[PDB]
């Protein structure tokens, strides 16, 4: 994780116009001073700087009386400004520098300007930024005057959030996303393919019906036209036994009637003999070879050019027709279980996701109410306290409580947590996050005004011990707490103005019992 190198303020709060530069240890550093030296300014110097629109919490009455009013020896300043300097040489910036520079300035007409390394950033971006880096997740890791009382006042479906942040289930909630959209895909081309069915399916049914119909007609065509050949064959053996006598009339009846009739059975007779010389030597011979009796060829002839009206209309394009929306058919009904089968499997993934989602949330959940436990025991010796999940089953729609019993003291709920305790209640918790996932820094502004000397004592170690791996800014008078600093800076105000000065173990002792009348 980042940590702060060092904060500046200029026309900040009760700083001066003077440029101000505010250098912070790695681990712990103390702010000290005074009831109104104003060393509180710089806990809200910092929410300021991260984009903070809070208001109230920035302890101004406006968002524009963060900016020097002015005092007797320095000009009000023409606007409030704070930049502060992270060191990211472990790259928890999204950003390929070991040093990210945030600032921030407000102008007295309310508007303000941000800057990152330099160049000009918008507020969502610096947003954006601070929470890739995990920078004050809910603000838990800021806590400013007010907030253990806020906290407390916090309900338990408002606790879980910061629970699923920590737990860092956002992966898993992308992965499922991106799932759930495949699957919306999946079942709305099955349910296209759905109504592409129920169409292809009726259309073959009229094409079914069409088929037949045209099949038969077929049928009906060739039978009929065999049958004109058979007719046609015997249409001359009996025209043949015909002119066998029916010109031998001639040379009998005699003033040329039987020439004229008789050219007439000829000249019928020729060409219905001919007429066959053009039609297929297959079929000529398919039927050469069955019955006679011309009236009923042609009685049976007048029935089957009967039934083919019968049929009419009939649409040939039917018979090829038919194949093609078969194939069309038979693929739909493919493709529909394809698609079936491509969404059961999305579905089974969706849950592998949920299940995954839910195990890291309760490892996480766990292991944080075991620190939790232990931590508040070593902060009210001989007490313990519990984190308690409120829906065991789908812990997301549920909230999350928290329960305490001081040594020999009754079981109370954080809603009801009222002296030192629910500070040093809120600080079991804050630690517990702290030992799983360590934000950045820590910033304690007050959090002792309301604790005895052993208390103190044992937070003060607490904090010492837990700097090994975060920092921590707090600012306090409490003389216990300045003793295991690394590094104490000191702020008073002379004539209107805040100072810090870099100072020392017993400097600050000094200055610190001497204010003390």
Known sequence: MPYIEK???????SYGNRKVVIPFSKGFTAIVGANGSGKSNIGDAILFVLGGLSAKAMRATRISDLIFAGSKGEPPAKYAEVAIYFNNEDRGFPIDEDEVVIKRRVYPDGRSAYWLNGRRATRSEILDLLSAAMISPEGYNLVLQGD???????SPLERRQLIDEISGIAEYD????????????????????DLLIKEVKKQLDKLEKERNDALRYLDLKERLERARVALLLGEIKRLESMIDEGERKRAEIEENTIKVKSAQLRIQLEEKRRELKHFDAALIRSVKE???????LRKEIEDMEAEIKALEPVNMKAIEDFEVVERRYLELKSKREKLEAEKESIIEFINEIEKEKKNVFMRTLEAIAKNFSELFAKLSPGGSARLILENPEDPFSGGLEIEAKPAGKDVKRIEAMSGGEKALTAL??????????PAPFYLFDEIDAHLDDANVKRVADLIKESSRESQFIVITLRDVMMANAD????VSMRDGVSRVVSLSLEKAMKILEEAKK
């Open 7 to 13: 904060l500046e303020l200029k026309g900040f709060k």
């Open 148 to 154: 253990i009382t806020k906290f407390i006042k916090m």
């Open 174 to 193: 992308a992965k499922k996303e991106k799932a759930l959209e495949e699957l919306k895909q999946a079942e709305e081309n099955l349910a296209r393919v």
């Open 290 to 296: 069955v019955s006679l009796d011309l009236e009923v």
């Open 428 to 437: 079991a918790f804050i630690f517990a996050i702290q030992r799983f996932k």
């Open 487 to 490: 590094k104490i800076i000191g």
